[PDB]
Amino acid sequence: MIIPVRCFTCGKIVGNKWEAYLGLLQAEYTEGDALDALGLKRYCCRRMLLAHVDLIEKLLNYAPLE
Amino acid sequence: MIYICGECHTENEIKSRDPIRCRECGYRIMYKKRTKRLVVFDAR
Amino acid sequence: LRRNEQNGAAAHVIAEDVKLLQFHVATMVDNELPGLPRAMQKSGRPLK
């Protein structure tokens, strides 16, 4: 829904990388090159950003009750 | 007490046996306030 | 049927009351017997 703070397997910080990863993908990087530029070497950290579904953006399209 | 209207986002005072209607927009679905009691979450 | 035999009544109405009493007693004992309508609650469900 939102990017996890830690990689589930190892605990590397990936919560500060989702917007940087989206900006790299917008800058015509491939997904592998964007993951390599962010220092995600292990494939456990790469599945964090590769397989993330950012559902919070679509949740923010609803008017808040509070 | 204070209920938020579902549509118009405004807070309204409702007494007991008063029909639940928003005095601004007449919307019948209203929600309670978040409590003021002190709730502790472990960050786990 | 106590009323219909304590005062005078016809033979056919007495026989019909006997038939209804027999049906009610039988459906008290057995409500799944074939050949007769099932005793049903007013909601439409049959009785147990």
Added chain:
Amino acid sequence: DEITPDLWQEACWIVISSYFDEKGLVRQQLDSFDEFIQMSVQRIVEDAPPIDLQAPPRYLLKFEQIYLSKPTHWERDGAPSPMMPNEARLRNLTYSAPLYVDITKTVIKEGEEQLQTQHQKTFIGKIPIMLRSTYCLLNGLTDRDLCELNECPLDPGGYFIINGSEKVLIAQEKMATNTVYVFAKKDSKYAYTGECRSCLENSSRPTSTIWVSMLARGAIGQRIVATLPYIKQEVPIIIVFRALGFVSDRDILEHIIYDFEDPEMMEMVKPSLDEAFVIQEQNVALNFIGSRGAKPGVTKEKRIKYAKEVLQKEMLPHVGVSDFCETKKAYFLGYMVHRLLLAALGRRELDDRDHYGNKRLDLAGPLLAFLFRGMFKNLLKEVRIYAQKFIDRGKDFNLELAIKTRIISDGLKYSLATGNWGDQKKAHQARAGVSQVLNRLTFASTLSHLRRLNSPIGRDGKLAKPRQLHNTLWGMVCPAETPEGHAVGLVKNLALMAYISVGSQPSPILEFLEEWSMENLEEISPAAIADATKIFVNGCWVGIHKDPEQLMNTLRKLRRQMDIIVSEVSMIRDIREREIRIYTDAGRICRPLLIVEKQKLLLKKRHIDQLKEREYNNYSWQDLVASGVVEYIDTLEEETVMLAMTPDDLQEKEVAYCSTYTHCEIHPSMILGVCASIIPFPDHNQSPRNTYQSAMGKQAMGVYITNFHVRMDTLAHVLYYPQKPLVTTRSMEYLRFRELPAGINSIVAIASYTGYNQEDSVIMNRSAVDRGFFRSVFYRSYKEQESKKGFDQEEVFEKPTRETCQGMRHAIYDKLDDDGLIAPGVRVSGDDVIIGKTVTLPRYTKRDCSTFLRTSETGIVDQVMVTLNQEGYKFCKIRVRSVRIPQIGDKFASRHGQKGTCGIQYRQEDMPFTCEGITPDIIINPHAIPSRMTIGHLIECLQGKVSANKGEIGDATPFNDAVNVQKISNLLSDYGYHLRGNEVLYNGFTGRKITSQIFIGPTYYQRLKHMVDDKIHSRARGPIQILNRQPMEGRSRDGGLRFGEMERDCQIAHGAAQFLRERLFEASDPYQVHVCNLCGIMAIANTRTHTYECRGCRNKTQISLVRMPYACKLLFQELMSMSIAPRMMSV
């Protein structure tokens, strides 16, 4: 230019993307409901006869034109409002639209002209509206408008809101109407039987079934008889032909046998002619028919009228019901007898019940039309009674007071709410489960439930044939998605590109056939039938054609360019049997196929290029249908087509195995349904494992819908961090699994580690779980309302007081606010009050009827909503949120049928690790693989390792030669890993290398709904049932477990008699009775005064105390109620 094989995969998924951009996935529900609303309601109102009423004054009531509004709500004030679907869900309203009608009342007096009253737009009830249909308020809205209305744009619609509950109409299979099916009844008096469930088209009426059967050999010869509707006995077929108006044997045999040079048909029709020789006139045959009717009239002319009514109105309504349409009926009955003789000769194969072109699918349209037909008949009946009453004693009646709108409104509401498809007073004799509560645990479960088919054959049936996966289910029904248990094979699911036909009028096709050289049946001699082709339109034999090949070419050309024949019309040429059958009716399941002409696709690169810019060119799937490139083929037509599996079957050399391909599959992986399309590499798995994954993908927790914060569902499940799979299928791009995923890509090592993953168990990483791996939220909603059940009784939401309320449950009430409702954000436990409701007792003026939280379900109040119900009382709904951290005993499944509970959780320092420090998130046992042969699990793990290293989403479309295990192995070896996915793992406890090398990599896992905390249950002592005084049912009522009969047998075989007595007597229901020592009947015992008296014996001293189960006392008293004397003798 032709599409090259290197571009073919991209082109075919382009055209599939175009199909799912136009149609979507719930098109069959929406199309059937739109046809029902636009066409079927008005047709039902028309076909209802006008009401003629005489005492005298004559009143003619005629219902003319319906009007349907948009779904509006009327509160107790009475001001209409546009009622939104979330308002209907939250306030427990029925999302229904008012249905008005135009009525004309004409008055016919004696010595007076006709008087017209135009009651325009008369309200006659409320039609429940399918969501996102034409008459829904969400129709035509953009995604931004849906989000502003707190609706999910990914929500498909296709369901109703009845009392706030989402109800889906499961499609119902039935035998096809108006078609002759010849079977061989086994162990019966009939050798063969022809059957035609005849139903008149363009109308909603019950189907009349006629059985043209032949008697068995075991009888001088075997004879043909006819079982007619509303006729008690079987009638010989020659008598039926004579009563139709053909007395000579020559005319009857001309109607039956089309080639008189065929002697064996003559030999088999000889016994029927010999049997029915004694009747030689039409009136004598009608007398013979009427002698065997439902009630045989004493007057012969009454029997003639009854027989004529049966033969015209009730015998084969589809070929003709009007007067003087008996020659078409005679030709059709002769065709039935001819088909029976063909089956008898072995010259034609027997029909197959399980053949799925002989089946139709009643969707929401036909089912709601059947309901509305019955209820409009009921409404006209009640209007007739009311107006009859006020013309009998009175003179005039008000029409607005005559109509009871409760009939239509509450009948539709009841049948959609309960699923019992019929009337409220006849629920036992009506089909149940037609309407079901829509599954909202996953988006995949919602889609699967919205595309669900049902065979209405009883699940207690132990015959295998309806449950078998028939050959004719290819591309129509998913071969993997079926339930397990009693409903296997009977409950089916749609394939992704399967579309159920909605129905069309036969009139354009009939007119075109009339002036395209087809000669009618009325204008031909029978001698022309032998060499010509019979033409059936919706099962009605309408004529014959002399040149059937150019006729079928012309008809296909018309359908391919979307001329006179519409796309969903099925046209079948039985070439060997010389028949052309045209079907326009609803319920035919079809699928689009690419058209092949002379071993070449009609789909060229220009179509693919136009479809690449779908939102620029305005080129769509419908333009591709209109181009004559694709066409919809149903199951009956598919039995005459020649399918190329791929275009590689077309571009084949000297022996192509076929040079006459007529169609090509768009993609074979489209034979799967919604739930089977998320399986990666399904053709590398055993088929029962694909079935098990199709079952468990509906139990997987993800994000079931986007607007889940607005909704208060009774059960809701939201994963924290759902991930799209690293290894996907292309069919998953249209199930919206990329936008609402259910699961997490997990580093899975398949290894035996500490023995805690044995027998379908997994070891989870506790450190991963601490970081949010598979953490979920459980939402539970509690509804309560004040209700005025009588003038004195008044339930009210109040904060109760101990010295004022009667019979509290000894709980705390301080967490309630002074409105009687708990506040959001407050922690709650199993013994806590969340809604404080008191009911006035007619010093304790009121007693406690507060709503309690379900036991052991600790959590936090997420939301509290207060509103008004339909009848204007205060209505509260409280959503309580509880965070479910993964636990030992929680169920987890991969996408390959590899279910299993968590056996243990190890921390990161205890789990085995690779040389890079990667520990598995989940360890599964190797022994889960070999007997299962879920090789697609291993290939998904390998492909996911490649995908996570490469930075791409792996493609696991089933039938794909571009993806191979060797290619994935070489790609993995290109990234510094062993090519087979093995890694050198080190023991977490000791640091030593594991001697074997462990298969490890990313695999998509799903957290299933079955947590252990929703299942753990213990009882020491507690609530008992009122009647038998035994413990209750289920953990929700603090009930006991059943020590059943099989357990009793096991403890008999153990020899443990005292344990058997403990379980079956004094851990369930101890009881003490007092019985007479003389008669054995239960005595009357006053234990306080020590008065042990037995009536019926005058016995006050020979009484004994007997310890028995309370159920045995209840049994003995029930037997005494049945005038049986169970006498317990202590000697």
Added chain:
RNA sequence: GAGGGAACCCACU
């Protein structure tokens, strides 16, 4: 320190 039954549907082993 514990006040409904029934029917149907889904699911689990």
